Amino acid sequence: QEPPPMESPFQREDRNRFDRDRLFSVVSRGVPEELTGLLEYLRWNSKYLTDSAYTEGSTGKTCLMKAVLNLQDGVNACIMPLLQIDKDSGNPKLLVNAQCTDEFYQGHSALHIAIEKRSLQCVKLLVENGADVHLRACGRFFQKHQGTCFYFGELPLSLAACTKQWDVVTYLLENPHQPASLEATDSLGNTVLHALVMIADNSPENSALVIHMYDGLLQMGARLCPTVQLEEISNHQGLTPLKLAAKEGKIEIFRHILQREFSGPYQPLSRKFTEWCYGPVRVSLYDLSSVDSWEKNSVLEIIAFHCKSPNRHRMVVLEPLNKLLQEKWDRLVSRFFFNFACYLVYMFIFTVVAYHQPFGESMLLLGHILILLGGIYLLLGQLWYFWRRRLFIWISFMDSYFEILFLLQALLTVLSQVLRFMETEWYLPLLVLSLVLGWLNLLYYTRGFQHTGIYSVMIQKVILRDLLRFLLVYLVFLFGFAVALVSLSREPYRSILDASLELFKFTIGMGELAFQEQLRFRGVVLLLLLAYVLLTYVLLLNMLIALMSETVNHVADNSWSIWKLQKAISVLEMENGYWWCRRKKHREGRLLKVGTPDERWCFRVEEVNWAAWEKTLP
Amino acid sequence: QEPPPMESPFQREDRNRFDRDRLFSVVSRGVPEELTGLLEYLRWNSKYLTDSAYTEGSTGKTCLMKAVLNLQDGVNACIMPLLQIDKDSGNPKLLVNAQCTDEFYQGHSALHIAIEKRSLQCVKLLVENGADVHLRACGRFFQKHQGTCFYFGELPLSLAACTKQWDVVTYLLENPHQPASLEATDSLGNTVLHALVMIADNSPENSALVIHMYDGLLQMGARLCPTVQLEEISNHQGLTPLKLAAKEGKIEIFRHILQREFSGPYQPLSRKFTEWCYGPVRVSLYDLSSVDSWEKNSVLEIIAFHCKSPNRHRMVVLEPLNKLLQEKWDRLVSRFFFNFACYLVYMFIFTVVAYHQPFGESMLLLGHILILLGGIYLLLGQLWYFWRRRLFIWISFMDSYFEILFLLQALLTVLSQVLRFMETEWYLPLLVLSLVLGWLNLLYYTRGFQHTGIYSVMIQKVILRDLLRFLLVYLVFLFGFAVALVSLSREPYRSILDASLELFKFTIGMGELAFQEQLRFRGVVLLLLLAYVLLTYVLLLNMLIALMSETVNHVADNSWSIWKLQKAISVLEMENGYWWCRRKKHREGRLLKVGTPDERWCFRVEEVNWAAWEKTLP
């Protein structure tokens, strides 16, 4: 069953002396007097407007919703009578606070509607007659999900703030009857600001809208609720508006929030204090509250792992983050290169042992046991990493696969060692394959060299999504032809799989196919192989084209950000220190008294901007 | 230890009845009267403001710096009192001239600050109270280096001129107390103009800024210092502003300076006198003082060798340089082609001798000894070239490598001849390899043909930076797999290196890999080779893509400039003549009396510009 629409002059309504139809029809046109007599009716048979008589069958919709949905000049002169009449009928469960009760429009009050319909003048009459404002509307249509939806925080006030309706916010916060708790929260845990960020796209116009509303609403909350900190509240997931903009990947607001400057009044609620400027350069203390790895759930962790979005990488290059990560890198590169050298020696030993295994006895046994130890230790390390980041692989595979390969290598090598202890012979293949995997995996340390990483990422830019969408087609082209050949030469190609292998290695260039002239049906095989080759060539060509379509689009300079991001990932993970030795994280920046006394840790960055400085010059 | 910041209302200060804190705090707000009583204090305990009491712990910063750093309406009414008070305290080492003494802010006077803070009104009070203006500020932060820095010449006047502050320059040069020596110089040797050029980027706005300041300041110096030549002064490196703009690679100012025209007054300080114009064409004598190869260190030498920048090539195409180099080329192409033919005959003889060495005795011995002579002579030539240009290879490798190969060839051939005289047999391989190298090196003469060079440079445009960043990855993919195969087939692939060679020549196409079915573990080898091939193919593909991303960007017409530049390099080097015969360079252009009598050598070029001529037409 589709969800019934809220307002349809055409699809009249469902149903699951005044009857419903008459009342709806009169309030629609919006004339007052046709209502007269209604009151009497109710007193006669003791009915209440919220009863199942006049409400909708499914949604529990009422008249008021209909009235507000049918306006003229932003007003519907019929309403105030309804409130007078309800109040005079003596209704226990008030009318105005009436909400829908279906799953789609759950909690869709009238006031949400008036707010959407942009009428201050109706909001006045409504809230001036006992209305409530904390009626969270938690229906599905209001929860953000793929498809038709409208997420605004499930609250009137947040709906306005999400809809630019300034003059309504001032009201909702400056009435004597029932103001809104600016620090309110929805069922999910979000307040207004979280909605502001949840709707935002990276588009510029929406971004200016939301920045404007954010700053203005923040000043309003500083005036009306100075004691509380609207920004450091968190939802039922454990995040803040900033962290949330990071996770969901909203940027252009993330940036603004991180480096927002306000001078004179409202100074305290800023996170960028301009310390001193000199011509081109402008050194300014940035606040890093909630973006340092010291705290349990820092913005950094989220940006690196929890987030799932392409523009992620573009979030780290900016300030202050870049300077901060550069500091941590300058601090931990030594430990990094040491891990590099140690693993490299492990690989050297593994190689030597492989090349020579088939007092030398003591040396070789020592090498073997040492390989075992190194593998088990590496395995523990990667397993701790995975326990800490279980979903991460499902999030950002392209930045993690080395974290897979390390573990795979340790697994295979330890299995090989146990097999060696056993009688079986399959230990040598697993061993040598692990050796290859390890020599290869010795590219996760390509990063620090600070140019080879920029060069590599391009090696990684080659997408394999295409492989997953492609291997299927190619595998068909292959398997079918191979079945055919084996069938036709049945009475080499004796076993199917091996012939499939012939065709594969031919398509590659490694191997030479067999067109046995001896076979009675030679011409058939020749034509069939020509088909194979034509189609495989075409398919490879299309793969090449769908690869080429990447660069031509003239995209530029991503790789730098991507390298910065891989380096940040590595450093931030390493920061925890190896599991066996738990590390005591190092606070960053220092505490400075700027507020008036509000105190905020800070980090000083020296940024020079020749072009910007000249632009300012007259 | 990070450098302390100059001004921080928040990070109060270090330390390494008036105490320091009170004085700083009062001058900050900028109120005069709270200072009263200070004077008395000093007379009581004989303290001086410049003493370690009131100055900064590290930098030696003083109060005045604080005051000027904290302005209101570009003024701080507290200052003049400080000067009065100091003068009245009888201080030996004046206050105003006080500078920092740390390594970061070394010599950061107050006046530099007022100049940066754009206040003429404070500069007035400061310089009108005994201030000095030649306080070179030679700190690190002021020396141009990678990262946070601000290079302006280490002088107030040059700071203004580098910061567009006209009205301040007029003052600094037109006060009776202490004007600035327009011909001043820093510790490094630079004057103002050198700073103007050192800051300039190729951006247009900065370029207009600097051109404006250059021309205006030059007129000012022509008025105030007519006797001296501000443009022909040189620094402690031995360069002029023009030469410096060339070396560092600043262009858009280089161009303007080379062809700058001023009519009527200030005519003399111009380097382009419009001789006669006729519709489209406009012949104009250009001055080449300091851009001819006659002088010891000409602009040309610098542009060809000493400079390290991409936009170098774009500096030569322009006038007058292009016409000049074209002249020298028309003059020396004969000698060039003769060197070509002589070396070609050398190669012909070398070939013949190789093909036939294994009265013919006299002929062959003559050929052998002749090869020796030619090689030793070529070696001397290239060695003289390297002695003269030692660093050049580290500067512009892509334009030099032939200068490497010639020498390498001479070395190997002479070694081969001595070996032939000896018993050993390795002479023949070295010899034939030198023969190949020589036939190849016979492409440095591809230039003169005047179209084959334009075609070749594209052959050179293929970057090998990628090779250096790539060969590593590929070598891993290769070596690891080869180790694996040799280990697995240990109990061909017997010796590792030879198997690595198999894999390499297979990846190329030259050689055929060996998948010995006899080997017990055949399937392992097959899968492993498939991995090798997949990954090598992917890697070659990524190399191809990172190559393709060059052309698509739609860059245009560079190659012409590049050919012109290679030809200029060749001619200018040849100009010295072969070492064995020292050449007497030929002055260019002629001397013409245009000034009023200033005399300047000149070169006449006939440039036609159809489009420009029409644009001028109304």
Side-chain angles (χ1 to χ4, degrees), chain A residues 275-279 355 432 436 455 458-459 508 554 590 592 606 614, chain B residues 8 11 108 116-117 148 205-206 466 469-470 481 484 487 537 542 554:
Chain A
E275 192 172 22
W276 61 276
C277 47
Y278 205 67
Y355 177 79
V432 70
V436 188
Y455 161 70
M458 301 292 169
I459 294 174
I508 274 165
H554 304 294
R590 30 184 168 183
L592 298 172
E606 316 182 1
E614 284 151 11
Chain B
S8 307
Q11 180 68 338
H108 188 59
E116 203 290 324
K117 291 305 188 195
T148 176
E205 184 260 354
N206 216 327
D466 194 83
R469 310 293 201 273
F470 165 95
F481 282 51
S487 87
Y537 267 38
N542 189 245
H554 304 294

mmCIF file of all heavy atoms in Angstrom, chain A residues 275-279 355 432 436 455 458-459 508 554 590 592 606 614, chain B residues 8 11 108 116-117 148 205-206 466 469-470 481 484 487 537 542 554:
data_model
loop_
_atom_site.group_PDB
_atom_site.id
_atom_site.type_symbol
_atom_site.label_atom_id
_atom_site.label_comp_id
_atom_site.label_asym_id
_atom_site.label_seq_id
_atom_site.Cartn_x
_atom_site.Cartn_y
_atom_site.Cartn_z
ATOM 1 N N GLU A 275 46.501 35.941 15.248
ATOM 2 C CA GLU A 275 47.501 36.352 16.220
ATOM 3 C C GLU A 275 48.296 37.529 15.687
ATOM 4 O O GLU A 275 48.308 38.608 16.288
ATOM 5 C CB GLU A 275 48.422 35.181 16.547
ATOM 6 C CG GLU A 275 49.316 35.410 17.733
ATOM 7 C CD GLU A 275 50.056 34.157 18.128
ATOM 8 O OE1 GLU A 275 50.197 33.258 17.274
ATOM 9 O OE2 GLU A 275 50.488 34.059 19.294
ATOM 10 N N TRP A 276 48.964 37.345 14.554
ATOM 11 C CA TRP A 276 49.665 38.469 13.961
ATOM 12 C C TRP A 276 49.851 38.239 12.472
ATOM 13 O O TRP A 276 50.105 37.117 12.029
ATOM 14 C CB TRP A 276 51.010 38.698 14.644
ATOM 15 C CG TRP A 276 51.953 37.559 14.555
ATOM 16 C CD1 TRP A 276 51.998 36.478 15.370
ATOM 17 C CD2 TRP A 276 53.021 37.400 13.618
ATOM 18 N NE1 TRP A 276 53.019 35.643 14.997
ATOM 19 C CE2 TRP A 276 53.663 36.189 13.921
ATOM 20 C CE3 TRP A 276 53.491 38.160 12.550
ATOM 21 C CZ2 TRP A 276 54.744 35.720 13.197
ATOM 22 C CZ3 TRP A 276 54.567 37.691 11.831
ATOM 23 C CH2 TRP A 276 55.181 36.484 12.158
ATOM 24 N N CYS A 277 49.732 39.322 11.720
ATOM 25 C CA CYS A 277 49.868 39.311 10.279
ATOM 26 C C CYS A 277 51.014 40.228 9.888
ATOM 27 O O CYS A 277 51.254 41.254 10.528
ATOM 28 C CB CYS A 277 48.573 39.760 9.603
ATOM 29 S SG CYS A 277 47.840 41.250 10.319
ATOM 30 N N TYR A 278 51.724 39.845 8.834
ATOM 31 C CA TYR A 278 52.857 40.622 8.345
ATOM 32 C C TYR A 278 52.849 40.497 6.828
ATOM 33 O O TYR A 278 53.282 39.478 6.285
ATOM 34 C CB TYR A 278 54.159 40.107 8.940
ATOM 35 C CG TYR A 278 55.267 41.121 9.004
ATOM 36 C CD1 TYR A 278 55.172 42.220 9.831
ATOM 37 C CD2 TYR A 278 56.408 40.979 8.241
ATOM 38 C CE1 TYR A 278 56.181 43.145 9.898
ATOM 39 C CE2 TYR A 278 57.417 41.899 8.301
ATOM 40 C CZ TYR A 278 57.298 42.981 9.128
ATOM 41 O OH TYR A 278 58.309 43.903 9.192
ATOM 42 N N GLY A 279 52.338 41.521 6.153
ATOM 43 C CA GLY A 279 52.309 41.523 4.714
ATOM 44 C C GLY A 279 51.670 40.256 4.191
ATOM 45 O O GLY A 279 50.457 40.053 4.290
ATOM 46 N N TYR A 355 65.997 -19.776 -0.439
ATOM 47 C CA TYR A 355 66.960 -20.054 -1.494
ATOM 48 C C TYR A 355 67.929 -21.170 -1.129
ATOM 49 O O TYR A 355 68.686 -21.617 -1.997
ATOM 50 C CB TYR A 355 67.727 -18.768 -1.794
ATOM 51 C CG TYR A 355 68.828 -18.879 -2.814
ATOM 52 C CD1 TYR A 355 68.548 -18.904 -4.170
ATOM 53 C CD2 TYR A 355 70.155 -18.942 -2.417
ATOM 54 C CE1 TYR A 355 69.558 -18.996 -5.103
ATOM 55 C CE2 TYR A 355 71.171 -19.034 -3.340
ATOM 56 C CZ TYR A 355 70.870 -19.059 -4.684
ATOM 57 O OH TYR A 355 71.881 -19.152 -5.612
ATOM 58 N N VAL A 432 56.865 -20.066 -0.592
ATOM 59 C CA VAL A 432 57.421 -19.210 -1.628
ATOM 60 C C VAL A 432 56.389 -18.183 -2.061
ATOM 61 O O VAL A 432 56.730 -17.042 -2.395
ATOM 62 C CB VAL A 432 57.905 -20.058 -2.811
ATOM 63 C CG1 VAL A 432 56.734 -20.638 -3.546
ATOM 64 C CG2 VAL A 432 58.734 -19.233 -3.723
ATOM 65 N N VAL A 436 56.778 -14.110 -2.171
ATOM 66 C CA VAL A 436 56.396 -13.159 -3.213
ATOM 67 C C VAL A 436 55.500 -12.087 -2.628
ATOM 68 O O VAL A 436 55.723 -10.883 -2.818
ATOM 69 C CB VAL A 436 55.699 -13.869 -4.382
ATOM 70 C CG1 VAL A 436 55.499 -12.904 -5.511
ATOM 71 C CG2 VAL A 436 56.515 -15.012 -4.864
ATOM 72 N N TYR A 455 53.850 9.304 -6.898
ATOM 73 C CA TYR A 455 53.928 8.603 -8.175
ATOM 74 C C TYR A 455 53.111 7.319 -8.140
ATOM 75 O O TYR A 455 52.484 6.945 -9.138
ATOM 76 C CB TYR A 455 55.377 8.295 -8.537
ATOM 77 C CG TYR A 455 55.480 7.207 -9.573
ATOM 78 C CD1 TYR A 455 55.072 7.435 -10.879
ATOM 79 C CD2 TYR A 455 55.966 5.950 -9.249
ATOM 80 C CE1 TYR A 455 55.155 6.444 -11.834
ATOM 81 C CE2 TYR A 455 56.049 4.953 -10.198
ATOM 82 C CZ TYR A 455 55.648 5.207 -11.488
ATOM 83 O OH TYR A 455 55.729 4.217 -12.432
ATOM 84 N N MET A 458 48.946 7.059 -8.564
ATOM 85 C CA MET A 458 48.492 6.874 -9.937
ATOM 86 C C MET A 458 48.415 5.394 -10.289
ATOM 87 O O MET A 458 47.438 4.944 -10.896
ATOM 88 C CB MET A 458 49.417 7.612 -10.901
ATOM 89 C CG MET A 458 49.505 9.102 -10.639
ATOM 90 S SD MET A 458 47.969 9.970 -10.993
ATOM 91 C CE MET A 458 48.340 11.568 -10.281
ATOM 92 N N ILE A 459 49.437 4.621 -9.911
ATOM 93 C CA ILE A 459 49.375 3.167 -10.053
ATOM 94 C C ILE A 459 48.124 2.625 -9.389
ATOM 95 O O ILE A 459 47.561 1.614 -9.829
ATOM 96 C CB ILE A 459 50.654 2.519 -9.481
ATOM 97 C CG1 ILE A 459 51.856 2.924 -10.332
ATOM 98 C CG2 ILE A 459 50.526 0.997 -9.406
ATOM 99 C CD1 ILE A 459 53.179 2.464 -9.776
ATOM 100 N N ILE A 508 46.744 -13.608 -23.233
ATOM 101 C CA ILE A 508 47.758 -12.800 -22.573
ATOM 102 C C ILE A 508 48.975 -12.626 -23.469
ATOM 103 O O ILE A 508 49.462 -11.509 -23.673
ATOM 104 C CB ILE A 508 48.140 -13.433 -21.226
ATOM 105 C CG1 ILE A 508 47.182 -12.958 -20.145
ATOM 106 C CG2 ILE A 508 49.553 -13.088 -20.855
ATOM 107 C CD1 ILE A 508 47.240 -13.764 -18.910
ATOM 108 N N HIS A 554 40.369 15.986 -17.511
ATOM 109 C CA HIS A 554 41.210 17.113 -17.128
ATOM 110 C C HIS A 554 41.267 17.326 -15.621
ATOM 111 O O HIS A 554 41.707 18.391 -15.170
ATOM 112 C CB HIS A 554 40.744 18.407 -17.802
ATOM 113 C CG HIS A 554 40.672 18.314 -19.293
ATOM 114 N ND1 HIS A 554 41.787 18.147 -20.086
ATOM 115 C CD2 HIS A 554 39.616 18.372 -20.138
ATOM 116 C CE1 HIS A 554 41.420 18.103 -21.353
ATOM 117 N NE2 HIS A 554 40.109 18.238 -21.413
ATOM 118 N N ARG A 590 49.135 23.934 22.785
ATOM 119 C CA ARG A 590 49.221 24.351 24.178
ATOM 120 C C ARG A 590 47.982 25.149 24.550
ATOM 121 O O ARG A 590 47.223 25.595 23.691
ATOM 122 C CB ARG A 590 50.487 25.170 24.451
ATOM 123 C CG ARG A 590 50.995 25.985 23.282
ATOM 124 C CD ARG A 590 52.290 26.674 23.654
ATOM 125 N NE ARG A 590 52.977 27.241 22.501
ATOM 126 C CZ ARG A 590 54.157 27.849 22.564
ATOM 127 N NH1 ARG A 590 54.780 27.969 23.727
ATOM 128 N NH2 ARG A 590 54.719 28.337 21.469
ATOM 129 N N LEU A 592 45.971 28.316 25.951
ATOM 130 C CA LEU A 592 46.133 29.758 25.885
ATOM 131 C C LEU A 592 44.851 30.430 26.347
ATOM 132 O O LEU A 592 43.760 30.047 25.914
ATOM 133 C CB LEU A 592 46.467 30.174 24.460
ATOM 134 C CG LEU A 592 47.776 29.575 23.955
ATOM 135 C CD1 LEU A 592 47.952 29.868 22.485
ATOM 136 C CD2 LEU A 592 48.958 30.078 24.748
ATOM 137 N N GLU A 606 51.942 28.898 10.399
ATOM 138 C CA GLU A 606 52.444 30.062 9.682
ATOM 139 C C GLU A 606 52.160 29.856 8.203
ATOM 140 O O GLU A 606 52.912 29.170 7.506
ATOM 141 C CB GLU A 606 53.934 30.256 9.942
ATOM 142 C CG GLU A 606 54.340 30.094 11.395
ATOM 143 C CD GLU A 606 55.817 30.331 11.614
ATOM 144 O OE1 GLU A 606 56.520 30.631 10.628
ATOM 145 O OE2 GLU A 606 56.273 30.219 12.771
ATOM 146 N N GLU A 614 48.297 40.518 -1.807
ATOM 147 C CA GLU A 614 48.263 41.559 -2.829
ATOM 148 C C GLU A 614 46.829 41.948 -3.153
ATOM 149 O O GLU A 614 46.528 43.128 -3.361
ATOM 150 C CB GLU A 614 48.980 41.086 -4.090
ATOM 151 C CG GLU A 614 50.487 41.098 -3.981
ATOM 152 C CD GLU A 614 51.144 40.045 -4.847
ATOM 153 O OE1 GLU A 614 50.443 39.441 -5.686
ATOM 154 O OE2 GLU A 614 52.363 39.827 -4.695
ATOM 155 N N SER B 8 51.683 38.532 20.351
ATOM 156 C CA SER B 8 50.662 37.587 20.794
ATOM 157 C C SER B 8 50.000 38.166 22.027
ATOM 158 O O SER B 8 50.562 38.105 23.132
ATOM 159 C CB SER B 8 51.257 36.216 21.096
ATOM 160 O OG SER B 8 52.003 35.738 19.993
ATOM 161 N N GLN B 11 49.548 34.379 23.964
ATOM 162 C CA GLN B 11 50.820 33.827 24.436
ATOM 163 C C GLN B 11 51.683 34.982 24.928
ATOM 164 O O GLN B 11 52.529 35.523 24.213
ATOM 165 C CB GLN B 11 51.510 33.038 23.334
ATOM 166 C CG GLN B 11 52.841 32.430 23.734
ATOM 167 C CD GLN B 11 52.702 31.320 24.754
ATOM 168 O OE1 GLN B 11 51.705 31.233 25.470
ATOM 169 N NE2 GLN B 11 53.709 30.459 24.825
ATOM 170 N N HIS B 108 65.183 42.937 13.335
ATOM 171 C CA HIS B 108 63.807 43.375 13.102
ATOM 172 C C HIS B 108 63.537 44.642 13.896
ATOM 173 O O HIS B 108 63.035 44.601 15.020
ATOM 174 C CB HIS B 108 62.835 42.275 13.488
ATOM 175 C CG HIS B 108 61.417 42.568 13.116
ATOM 176 N ND1 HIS B 108 61.026 42.808 11.819
ATOM 177 C CD2 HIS B 108 60.299 42.664 13.871
ATOM 178 C CE1 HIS B 108 59.726 43.035 11.789
ATOM 179 N NE2 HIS B 108 59.260 42.953 13.021
ATOM 180 N N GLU B 116 55.567 48.119 7.614
ATOM 181 C CA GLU B 116 54.649 47.040 7.284
ATOM 182 C C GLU B 116 53.231 47.390 7.711
ATOM 183 O O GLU B 116 52.267 47.071 7.007
ATOM 184 C CB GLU B 116 55.110 45.743 7.937
ATOM 185 C CG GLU B 116 54.587 44.508 7.252
ATOM 186 C CD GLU B 116 53.102 44.318 7.457
ATOM 187 O OE1 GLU B 116 52.607 44.644 8.556
ATOM 188 O OE2 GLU B 116 52.426 43.851 6.517
ATOM 189 N N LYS B 117 53.082 48.049 8.856
ATOM 190 C CA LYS B 117 51.762 48.428 9.334
ATOM 191 C C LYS B 117 51.206 49.650 8.622
ATOM 192 O O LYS B 117 50.121 50.115 8.983
ATOM 193 C CB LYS B 117 51.788 48.659 10.844
ATOM 194 C CG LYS B 117 52.000 47.394 11.650
ATOM 195 C CD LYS B 117 50.956 46.355 11.294
ATOM 196 C CE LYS B 117 51.001 45.160 12.204
ATOM 197 N NZ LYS B 117 50.227 44.039 11.622
ATOM 198 N N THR B 148 57.883 29.174 5.545
ATOM 199 C CA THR B 148 57.574 30.483 6.097
ATOM 200 C C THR B 148 58.764 31.414 5.950
ATOM 201 O O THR B 148 59.865 31.112 6.414
ATOM 202 C CB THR B 148 57.193 30.347 7.569
ATOM 203 O OG1 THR B 148 56.976 31.646 8.126
ATOM 204 C CG2 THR B 148 58.299 29.649 8.340
ATOM 205 N N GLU B 205 49.267 40.050 -11.848
ATOM 206 C CA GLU B 205 49.025 41.168 -10.942
ATOM 207 C C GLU B 205 50.305 41.575 -10.226
ATOM 208 O O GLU B 205 50.657 42.761 -10.176
ATOM 209 C CB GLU B 205 47.936 40.798 -9.939
ATOM 210 C CG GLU B 205 47.554 41.935 -9.008
ATOM 211 C CD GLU B 205 48.201 41.837 -7.640
ATOM 212 O OE1 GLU B 205 48.877 40.824 -7.360
ATOM 213 O OE2 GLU B 205 48.029 42.782 -6.842
ATOM 214 N N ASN B 206 50.996 40.601 -9.633
ATOM 215 C CA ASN B 206 52.292 40.877 -9.030
ATOM 216 C C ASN B 206 53.224 41.528 -10.035
ATOM 217 O O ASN B 206 54.004 42.423 -9.691
ATOM 218 C CB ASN B 206 52.908 39.583 -8.507
ATOM 219 C CG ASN B 206 53.681 39.782 -7.236
ATOM 220 O OD1 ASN B 206 54.285 40.829 -7.018
ATOM 221 N ND2 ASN B 206 53.672 38.773 -6.380
ATOM 222 N N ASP B 466 59.590 9.565 -14.544
ATOM 223 C CA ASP B 466 58.756 8.389 -14.358
ATOM 224 C C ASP B 466 59.587 7.119 -14.316
ATOM 225 O O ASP B 466 59.294 6.207 -13.540
ATOM 226 C CB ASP B 466 57.723 8.302 -15.476
ATOM 227 C CG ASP B 466 56.619 7.322 -15.167
ATOM 228 O OD1 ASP B 466 55.668 7.710 -14.459
ATOM 229 O OD2 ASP B 466 56.704 6.163 -15.626
ATOM 230 N N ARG B 469 61.053 6.817 -10.882
ATOM 231 C CA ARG B 469 60.042 6.505 -9.876
ATOM 232 C C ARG B 469 59.403 5.138 -10.105
ATOM 233 O O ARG B 469 58.696 4.644 -9.221
ATOM 234 C CB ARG B 469 58.956 7.582 -9.844
ATOM 235 C CG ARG B 469 59.468 9.013 -9.759
ATOM 236 C CD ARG B 469 60.157 9.284 -8.434
ATOM 237 N NE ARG B 469 60.208 10.709 -8.111
ATOM 238 C CZ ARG B 469 61.164 11.544 -8.512
ATOM 239 N NH1 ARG B 469 62.166 11.116 -9.261
ATOM 240 N NH2 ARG B 469 61.113 12.821 -8.163
ATOM 241 N N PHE B 470 59.648 4.527 -11.262
ATOM 242 C CA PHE B 470 58.952 3.352 -11.769
ATOM 243 C C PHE B 470 59.790 2.088 -11.699
ATOM 244 O O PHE B 470 59.327 1.042 -11.219
ATOM 245 C CB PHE B 470 58.594 3.639 -13.232
ATOM 246 C CG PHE B 470 58.197 2.439 -14.026
ATOM 247 C CD1 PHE B 470 56.875 2.097 -14.177
ATOM 248 C CD2 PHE B 470 59.161 1.665 -14.652
ATOM 249 C CE1 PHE B 470 56.521 1.008 -14.928
ATOM 250 C CE2 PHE B 470 58.812 0.569 -15.395
ATOM 251 C CZ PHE B 470 57.489 0.238 -15.534
ATOM 252 N N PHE B 481 59.365 -12.283 -7.721
ATOM 253 C CA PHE B 481 58.864 -13.433 -8.457
ATOM 254 C C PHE B 481 60.008 -14.333 -8.898
ATOM 255 O O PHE B 481 59.888 -15.564 -8.870
ATOM 256 C CB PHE B 481 58.063 -12.965 -9.665
ATOM 257 C CG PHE B 481 56.683 -12.495 -9.332
ATOM 258 C CD1 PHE B 481 56.477 -11.565 -8.340
ATOM 259 C CD2 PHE B 481 55.593 -12.987 -10.012
ATOM 260 C CE1 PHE B 481 55.210 -11.127 -8.038
ATOM 261 C CE2 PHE B 481 54.322 -12.556 -9.715
ATOM 262 C CZ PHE B 481 54.130 -11.627 -8.723
ATOM 263 N N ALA B 484 61.252 -16.389 -6.101
ATOM 264 C CA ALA B 484 60.281 -17.439 -5.843
ATOM 265 C C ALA B 484 60.462 -18.601 -6.805
ATOM 266 O O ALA B 484 60.511 -19.765 -6.392
ATOM 267 C CB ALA B 484 58.873 -16.871 -5.960
ATOM 268 N N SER B 487 63.600 -20.629 -6.202
ATOM 269 C CA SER B 487 63.460 -21.445 -5.004
ATOM 270 C C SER B 487 62.585 -22.656 -5.278
ATOM 271 O O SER B 487 62.888 -23.769 -4.834
ATOM 272 C CB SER B 487 62.865 -20.614 -3.872
ATOM 273 O OG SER B 487 61.450 -20.652 -3.926
ATOM 274 N N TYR B 537 51.601 -5.905 -16.780
ATOM 275 C CA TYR B 537 50.745 -5.249 -17.761
ATOM 276 C C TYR B 537 50.072 -4.031 -17.151
ATOM 277 O O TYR B 537 50.046 -2.953 -17.751
ATOM 278 C CB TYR B 537 49.702 -6.235 -18.283
ATOM 279 C CG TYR B 537 50.114 -6.969 -19.537
ATOM 280 C CD1 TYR B 537 51.421 -7.385 -19.723
ATOM 281 C CD2 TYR B 537 49.189 -7.258 -20.529
ATOM 282 C CE1 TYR B 537 51.801 -8.056 -20.866
ATOM 283 C CE2 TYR B 537 49.559 -7.929 -21.675
ATOM 284 C CZ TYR B 537 50.867 -8.327 -21.837
ATOM 285 O OH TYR B 537 51.247 -8.998 -22.977
ATOM 286 N N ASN B 542 49.791 1.886 -16.435
ATOM 287 C CA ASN B 542 49.812 3.101 -15.634
ATOM 288 C C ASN B 542 50.920 4.035 -16.095
ATOM 289 O O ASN B 542 50.748 5.261 -16.097
ATOM 290 C CB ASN B 542 50.002 2.759 -14.164
ATOM 291 C CG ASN B 542 49.809 3.952 -13.265
ATOM 292 O OD1 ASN B 542 50.743 4.405 -12.603
ATOM 293 N ND2 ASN B 542 48.588 4.465 -13.225
ATOM 294 N N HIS B 554 46.501 20.083 -23.463
ATOM 295 C CA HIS B 554 46.339 21.036 -24.553
ATOM 296 C C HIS B 554 47.462 22.063 -24.615
ATOM 297 O O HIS B 554 47.321 23.084 -25.301
ATOM 298 C CB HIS B 554 44.996 21.765 -24.459
ATOM 299 C CG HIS B 554 43.816 20.846 -24.414
ATOM 300 N ND1 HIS B 554 43.456 20.040 -25.472
ATOM 301 C CD2 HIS B 554 42.911 20.609 -23.437
ATOM 302 C CE1 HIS B 554 42.382 19.346 -25.148
ATOM 303 N NE2 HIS B 554 42.029 19.673 -23.918
#
